[PDB]
Amino acid sequence: FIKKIKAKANNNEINVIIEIPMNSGPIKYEFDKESGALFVDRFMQTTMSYPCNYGFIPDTLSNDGDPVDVLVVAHHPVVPGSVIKCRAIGVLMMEDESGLDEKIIAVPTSKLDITFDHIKELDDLCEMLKKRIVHFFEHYKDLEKGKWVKVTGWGDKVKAETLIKEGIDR
Amino acid sequence: FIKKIKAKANNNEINVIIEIPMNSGPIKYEFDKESGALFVDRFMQTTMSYPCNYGFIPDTLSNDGDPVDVLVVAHHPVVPGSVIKCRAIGVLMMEDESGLDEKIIAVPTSKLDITFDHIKELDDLCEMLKKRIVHFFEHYKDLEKGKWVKVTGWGDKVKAETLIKEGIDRN
Amino acid sequence: KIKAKANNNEINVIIEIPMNSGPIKYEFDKESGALFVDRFMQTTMSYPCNYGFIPDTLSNDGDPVDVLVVAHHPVVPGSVIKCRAIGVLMMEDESGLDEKIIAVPTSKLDITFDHIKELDDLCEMLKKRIVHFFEHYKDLEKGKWVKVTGWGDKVKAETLIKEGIDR
Amino acid sequence: FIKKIKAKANNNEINVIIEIPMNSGPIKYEFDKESGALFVDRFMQTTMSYPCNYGFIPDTLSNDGDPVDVLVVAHHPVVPGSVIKCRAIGVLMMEDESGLDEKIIAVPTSKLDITFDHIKELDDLCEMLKKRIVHFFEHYKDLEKGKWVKVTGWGDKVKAETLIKEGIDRN
Amino acid sequence: KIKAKANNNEINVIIEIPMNSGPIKYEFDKESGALFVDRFMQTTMSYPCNYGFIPDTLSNDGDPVDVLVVAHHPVVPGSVIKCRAIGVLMMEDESGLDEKIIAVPTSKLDITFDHIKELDDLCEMLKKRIVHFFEHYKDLEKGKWVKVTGWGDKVKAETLIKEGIDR
Amino acid sequence: FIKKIKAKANNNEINVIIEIPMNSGPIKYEFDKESGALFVDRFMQTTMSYPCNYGFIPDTLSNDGDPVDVLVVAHHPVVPGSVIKCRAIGVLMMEDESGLDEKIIAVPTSKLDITFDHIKELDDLCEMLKKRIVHFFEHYKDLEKGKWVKVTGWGDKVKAETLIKEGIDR
Ligand SMILES: [Cl-]
Ligand SMILES: [Cl-]
Ligand SMILES: [Cl-]
Ligand SMILES: [Cl-]
Ligand SMILES: [Cl-]
Ligand SMILES: [Cl-]
Ligand SMILES: [Cl-]
Ligand SMILES: [Cl-]
Ligand SMILES: [Cl-]
Ligand SMILES: [Cl-]
Ligand SMILES: [Cl-]
Ligand SMILES: [Cl-]
Ligand SMILES: [Cl-]
Ligand SMILES: [Cl-]
Ligand SMILES: [Cl-]
Ligand SMILES: [Cl-]
Ligand SMILES: [Cl-]
Ligand SMILES: [Cl-]
Ligand SMILES: [Cl-]
Ligand SMILES: [Cl-]
Numbered sequence A, F: 001f002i003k004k005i006k007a008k009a010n011n012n013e014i015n016v017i018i019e020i021p022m023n024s025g026p027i028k029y030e031f032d033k034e035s036g037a038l039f040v041d042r043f044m045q046t047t048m049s050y051p052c053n054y055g056f057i058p059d060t061l062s063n064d065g066d067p068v069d070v071l072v073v074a075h076h077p078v079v080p081g082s083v084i085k086c087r088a089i090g091v092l093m094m095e096d097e098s099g100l101d102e103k104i105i106a107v108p109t110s111k112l113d114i115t116f117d118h119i120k121e122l123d124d125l126c127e128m129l130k131k132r133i134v135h136f137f138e139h140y141k142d143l144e145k146g147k148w149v150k151v152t153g154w155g156d157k158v159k160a161e162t163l164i165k166e167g168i169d170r
Numbered sequence B, D: 001f002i003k004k005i006k007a008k009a010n011n012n013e014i015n016v017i018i019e020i021p022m023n024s025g026p027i028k029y030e031f032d033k034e035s036g037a038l039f040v041d042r043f044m045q046t047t048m049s050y051p052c053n054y055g056f057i058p059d060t061l062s063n064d065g066d067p068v069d070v071l072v073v074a075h076h077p078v079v080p081g082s083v084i085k086c087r088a089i090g091v092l093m094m095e096d097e098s099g100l101d102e103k104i105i106a107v108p109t110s111k112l113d114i115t116f117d118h119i120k121e122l123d124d125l126c127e128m129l130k131k132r133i134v135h136f137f138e139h140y141k142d143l144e145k146g147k148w149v150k151v152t153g154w155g156d157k158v159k160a161e162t163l164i165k166e167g168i169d170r171n
Numbered sequence C, E: 001k002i003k004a005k006a007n008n009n010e011i012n013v014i015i016e017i018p019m020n021s022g023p024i025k026y027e028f029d030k031e032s033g034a035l036f037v038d039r040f041m042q043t044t045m046s047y048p049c050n051y052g053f054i055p056d057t058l059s060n061d062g063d064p065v066d067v068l069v070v071a072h073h074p075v076v077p078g079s080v081i082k083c084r085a086i087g088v089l090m091m092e093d094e095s096g097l098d099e100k101i102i103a104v105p106t107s108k109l110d111i112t113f114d115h116i117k118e119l120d121d122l123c124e125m126l127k128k129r130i131v132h133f134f135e136h137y138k139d140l141e142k143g144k145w146v147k148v149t150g151w152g153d154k155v156k157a158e159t160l161i162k163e164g165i166d167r
Helices: A127-139 A157-169 B127-139 B157-170 C124-136 C154-166 D127-139 D157-170 E124-136 E154-166 F127-139 F157-169
Strands: A014-020 A027-031 A038-043 A053-056 A069-072 A083-096 A099-108 A149-155 B014-020 B027-031 B038-043 B053-056 B069-072 B083-096 B099-108 B149-155 C011-017 C024-028 C035-040 C050-053 C066-069 C080-093 C096-105 C146-152 D014-020 D027-031 D038-043 D053-056 D069-072 D083-096 D100-108 D149-155 E011-017 E024-028 E035-040 E050-054 E065-069 E079-093 E096-105 E146-152 F014-020 F027-031 F038-043 F053-056 F069-072 F083-096 F099-108 F149-155
Touching (some): A014 A069, A014 A099, A069 A083, A083 A127, A083 A157, A127 A149, A149 A157, B014 B069, B014 B099, B069 B083, B083 B157, B099 B157, B127 B149, C011 C024, C011 C066, C011 C096, C080 C124, C096 C146, C096 C154, D014 D069, D014 D100, D069 D083, D100 D157, D149 D157, E011 E065, E011 E096, E065 E079, E065 E154, E079 E124, E079 E154, E146 E154, F014 F027, F014 F069, F069 F083, F083 F127, F083 F157, F099 F149, F127 F149
Parallel strands (some): A038 C080, B069 B099, B083 C035, D038 F083, E065 E096, F069 F099
Antiparallel strands (some): A014 A053, A014 A083, A027 A038, A053 A069, A083 A099, A083 A149, B014 B053, B014 B083, B083 B099, B083 B149, C011 C050, C024 C035, C050 C066, C080 C096, C080 C146, D014 D053, D014 D083, D027 D038, D083 D100, D083 D149, E011 E050, E079 E096, E079 E146, F014 F053, F014 F083, F027 F038, F053 F069
């Protein structure tokens, strides 16, 4: 199914296949590219869990050979393997032990969740929500030897849009 | 997998691909027929959640080209995308903003849940469950602009079987 | 599509029934790749382990080699755990004889299982719960029963897996 | 609060203080009568959970001095320590390591859940629920050293009402 | 034993029914202090907010002043949320007037609610869901109904609370 | 009920009233000893939740005026307000913004959970559990202005028992 979902349904939206639902315990899942199966990547050893629904845009390629990764801000978790129709609003800038690490910040389209309609940019998101996202990524690998993540900042909507465009065209 | 499952395993059962589990919060899921992926359709704005497991019968086309939809009465939710083996016992009749809408009422086979063995028709279901199904569909689109639902009535098992048969034939 | 083994020290296990997940028994259908509800269990019992099978395997029952993955947390149905076999559980039932592989996540998935090399490393009460589950879970199912006969060691598990892969 | 609740609100009702919710994992709770605190009794070692909401009737004393205990057949779990208004429909008769053991079977009053209104006797409950209640109690102490339970049979409504009345009179 | 107010800008709210917690309605019994099951609700609906009451208060119904606490998470029945009122929901039931205070946790419990000072600060879909719930949660209960007639401001709420304490 | 439960049932046992169940989301509860009610202390803003069942020994008085606090290592969460019968095996030593901060480390007695019979000292707990507990306390207040926690080390069973005895006798 992953090879036949489009990256974008229209000009304004992106399709994001969820791998890890918000607040759903210690399991990190990842889709295997060459089989389409959902693999357990890790039983996490902290008490932490994802601050948003996490997944990727199908039919995309980042610089690292992986699809473009997305954090979908939502009011509720969604099952792994399900697709949320979203719009990009910004990007989370990070660095891990192997270099640059960017995630798109997206919200569901208004036909899925009208309460996000007024959310157009990162500045419209709750400060504590953003602090919590930062805290999660800066700390979720603290007990994992060899691996770390540092947040460097945020990028705007235009940056999110160009990165997704670059991932579709690459 | 949707394009690989028969509508009926035998004369007396239907396969029902589940989209929305019973009593499982505000998420409304739907299979996209082109990709075969399960899409989030809506984060529902009411406090309501589905009174039965909800899905469709593969390899059927209803009147309007959509697969035949099913309410699987059960005691427990199942995973979205899992398939329940069922038998039809009736149909729920409604009207929505785009016209006539009908949903089959079904129960698992006795091989799956023996406790449903003696439920042969709608009248075998308790009154309050039927009332809750009606009240759900009448009200779950109350906060959704442009979209409404009104329940017309019920039809028996023979009406369900004819509806399923015409779905398989149309497919 | 998915290998039975990623390397010599590992098995891939597709989960059908998560540990401690209520009454639903699931089973993957080969031809469709769909997850079918097998039954709604009539007892108050749940699986004591994540339960599934090794892809690309075939045992004498005509089914793939099935596996009880000992774990600290449930995993969603249809997800794949990277594992290693440590033992086998031996059973008899109404259909003949039955064997389930006892596996644990690789140390890449869950470092806390690194010290678990054999069945003797599993805690006693876990093994008793496992035995108790299989001996009683079909109690309210007419015409079906299970009886646990014993355990098999690591090499026995590897042999059963090798044989499953060849067949 | 245990000390401030009547056994019976009216002639056809019992107040039931819940210790263990149905289907709520491996925790077995019990009210300490001296402190009024809810203690953890056991982290159960089987995979089993309670088939009904389980508790006792305040201001009753069974033949062995314990309060009269009750299985409350309901469609949903209730928080530990909460009180459900019920009517008795029967008794489950058992034998344990200490000796004779009896649990009243009750359902919520119609004011709390109208769907229980037509359940008057034990034969009105479905066969598989009764078999599951029996199966639970016969096996839940299987992994517990020195403790066992054996079901000896069921008693009707009149039997439950007598047992409750003797319970109040003994208190 | 619990005060109605910790200070001038705060009310203590004992929770009876947590938000999004299924069909059970609970009510505290004053004499025993026990949490009674009031109803197994027959709809698929659940409470849109944490629902409880201000201890040491008396309304016209003979009950304490009740309160819908806007929160991001459920809290256990019997626990106490430190709150502040921002408004009132005005309703009419089969027995007369039905008023309920709209409260938010204090900034010491949840800083994200600091900017919510009046009902206009609450998002409108939430307010629509609140109204929807109260207008339909008694639909399957014979002889009982509710009509929402409007909202009242913070001053209206503080007056209602002060009277409840005085009474 | 709080003022009716004993601190210790026998020589080998402590009674611990649970305020916060392990892995049970953002809600941080605390008993008000003046009223006996369970208050919400905080809606936590991180993705973290308690790694143990957390509560106190009733009828105890610490140096700081509060009951002796306990982290009960257990295999499952327990409802708030319920009492677990435990034995102390050690102490978590910490400092917060207002000074010394010790928590007892306990396990259920063998009559409640036999799988803890062999755990007699902190060395018997697995390393990752202890790393997770340390990590929780060092970070759970990161998003809370003016409050912090530093872990200084661990004390043995004797230190635990002395602290408990001091709390009962104070
Ligand atoms: Cl980790
Ligand atoms: Cl949009
Ligand atoms: Cl975090
Ligand atoms: Cl875009
Ligand atoms: Cl909606
Ligand atoms: Cl059948
Ligand atoms: Cl409804
Ligand atoms: Cl069964
Ligand atoms: Cl390994
Ligand atoms: Cl078991
Ligand atoms: Cl046990
Ligand atoms: Cl009644
Ligand atoms: Cl059972
Ligand atoms: Cl109702
Ligand atoms: Cl405030
Ligand atoms: Cl609603
Ligand atoms: Cl916080
Ligand atoms: Cl002990
Ligand atoms: Cl942590
Ligand atoms: Cl001690």
